[PDB]
Design a protein around this ligand. Sequence first.
Ligand code: VO4
Length: 297
Amino acid sequence: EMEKEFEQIDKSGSWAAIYQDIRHEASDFPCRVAKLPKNKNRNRYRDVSPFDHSRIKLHQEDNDYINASLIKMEEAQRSYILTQGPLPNTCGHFWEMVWEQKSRGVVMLNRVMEKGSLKCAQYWPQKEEKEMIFEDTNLKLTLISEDIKSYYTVRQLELENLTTQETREILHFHYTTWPDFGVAESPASFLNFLFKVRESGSLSPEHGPVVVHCSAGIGRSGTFCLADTCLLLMDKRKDPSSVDIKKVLLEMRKFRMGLIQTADQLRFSYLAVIEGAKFIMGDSSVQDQWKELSHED
Ligand code: VO4
């Protein structure tokens, strides 16, 4: 059904019209805390801020601001934290957020350098023997192992609360071939990566919300969460036709501004959900088909 809607929009060539409608319908809530003068150096982009009602607050008395939003999909019963690529001065805040929110997975959809510019701090260690200590938030981070595939890398990290000496395993899922304001190479390649995140346990309700980011934490991050929630809703009722992608996106836009930054990303979201529906509706072999088509070795 979503498939036939997809074909209607393609034949009309009205992806831009549909996407601008979403933009005009999208919620508009205040971002007063993000705009305080004292927080200016905590925001990577002047025009990408968390709403006050849904922002993640750090558990510190000094300044609890971080550019991060809690997306709570009530009906699908999944939550995500969407955040910007950490800044040189906010890597401690980032890992403090991960600790306090009890997240098990971090999904990173960007490269540290994209289009010749630095999009994100190097906020996790690249070498086992060179751990990182974030002195402002009293956290230590150690690379434990790395599994490099052709277009994504999975890292096992150990996060230590230096104050309590509690340790935690964090899984890092790094998509390395998704261009800013672009789409993944194929649905199959995107779905293969999403299902790798799912199979790690990182999205399970026994854990805190997965942390999802790219550079701004809205475009690629929005595509990832939208596809996931749509597939989860379909799974819940085994009813692909009860899932209205545009309504799920607007619901997600109540928690964070600008989710999906281009009409082509919206169109890709449809493709990913339409294709992923094959798996959700009983055809477990398409998962293997996606892994082959993705060429991850
Ligand atoms: O770094 V993103 O522009 O896909 O929000």
